[PDB]
Design a protein around this ligand. Structure first.
Ligand code: IV5
Lengths: 10, 237
C-alpha cells in the first residue's frame, strides 16, 4: 500500500 | 559522570548516519526542477522528496529502527518525516540572512516565496521562529543528531502499534542525550528541557503543514506538481 516506502526500507 | 560505552556507540553510529545522508555541498540540488521566482512548488516538491529519501536512509541506521516491523517503520516515517526535515534544515538556516542557503543565489530560499510554493505565513512565521530558536541553542552535532532520532522514535504517533518497544528505544536515546549534555556540553544544564520543548514545537508545525498540504493535494492542478514519494509519504493511507 506504500509501495515506494517498502522498497526504500529494503 | 561519564558516558558508558554503549551510550557512545549509539552516538557514534548516529553521527555516521547523519554524515552519510546530509551533503553540505548541496550539489544534488541542480537535479531538481529549477526554482522560478505556484512557481516555486515544483522545486520544493523535489527538494522535499529528496530529503524524505535522506531521512529514510538516516532512519535505517538508527540502532534497532530496522528491527521494527515494516509497518511500524512506515508509520513513524509518515508522521515524523516533516518534523525531521524541519530539524535537519537548521544546518542550512542562517541567522544573518534569516533564510536557508543551499548553493548560489538560486538555492537561497527566503520566505517571501512562501505563497509561490502554495503555503502561507501561518506556517512560515512559526517555522522561521522555530528555526532561530533552534539556532540559538547552538547544538553540538551530537545533540542535533540525537534530537532527530528522538523525534523519529516517538511512540505517540498515529499508526504505531508497538508503542512499548519504541518507547524503550526513545528512552535509551534520551538517557544518552541527557548524559551527553551533563558530561560534554559546557553550560549544558537546562538544554535538555529546551530541546524537548522543541519537540512539542514540531508537533505544532507538523499540524499546520499537514493542514496546508491537504489544500494542495486536493487541487489536482497543484498535486500534479508533487512527486510520487511526497504523495505516498504525506498521503493518508
Ligand atoms: C529540506 C531541507 C532544506 C530546507 C527545508 C525547508 C526550506 C524551505 C524553503 C521555502 C521558503 C520559500 C522558498 C517558500 O520562500 C523546509 C523544511 C520543512 C518544512 C518546510 C515548509 C515548506 C515545505 C513544503 C512541502 C510541500 C509543498 C510538499 O507541502 C520547509 C534545505 C537543506 O537543509 C536540506 C533540508 O533537508
Amino acid at each position: 500500500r506504500h509501495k515506494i516506502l517498502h522498497r526504500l526500507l529494503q | 559522570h561519564m558516558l558508558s560505552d554503549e551510550q557512545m556507540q549509539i552516538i557514534n553510529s548516529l553521527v555516521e548516519a547523519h554524515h552519510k545522508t546530509y551533503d553540505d555541498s548541496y550539489s544534488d540540488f541542480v537535479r531538481f526542477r529549477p526554482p522560478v521566482r505556484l512557481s516555486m512548488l515544483p522545486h520544493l516538491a523535489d527538494l522535499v522528496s529528496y530529503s524524505i529519501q535522506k531521512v529514510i536512509g538516516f532512519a535505517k541506521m538508527i540502532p534497532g529502527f530496522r528491527d521494527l516491523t515494516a509497518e511500524d517503520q512506515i508509520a513513524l516515517l509518515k508522521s515524523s518525516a516533516i518534523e525531521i526535515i524541519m530539524l535537519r534544515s537548521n544546518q542550512s538556516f542562517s541567522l544573518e540572512d534569516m533564510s536557508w542557503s543551499c548553493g548560489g543565489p538560486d538555492f537561497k530560499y527566503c520566505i517571501n516565496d512562501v505563497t509561490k510554493a502554495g503555503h502561507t505565513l501561518e506556517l512560515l512565521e512559526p517555522l522561521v521562529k522555530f528555526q532561530v530558536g533552534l539556532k540559538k541553542l547552538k547544538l553540538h552535532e551530537e545533540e542535533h543528531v540525537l534530537l532527530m532520532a528522538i523525534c523519529l522514535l516517538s511512540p505517540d504517533r498515529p499508526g504505531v502499534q508497538d508503542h512499548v518497544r519504541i518507547e524503550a528505544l526513545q528512552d535509551r536515546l534520551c538517557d544518552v542525550l541527557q548524559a551527553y549534555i551533563r558530561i560534554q556540553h559546557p553550560g549544558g544544564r537546562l538544554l535538555y528541557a529546551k530541546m524537548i520543548q522543541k519537540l512539542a514545537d514540531l508537533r505544532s508545525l507538523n499540524e499546520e503543514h499537514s493542514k496546508q498540504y491537504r489544500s494542495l493535494s486536493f487541487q489536482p492542478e497543484h498535486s500534479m506538481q508533487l512527486t510520487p514519494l511526497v504523495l505516498e509519504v504525506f498521503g493518508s493511507e
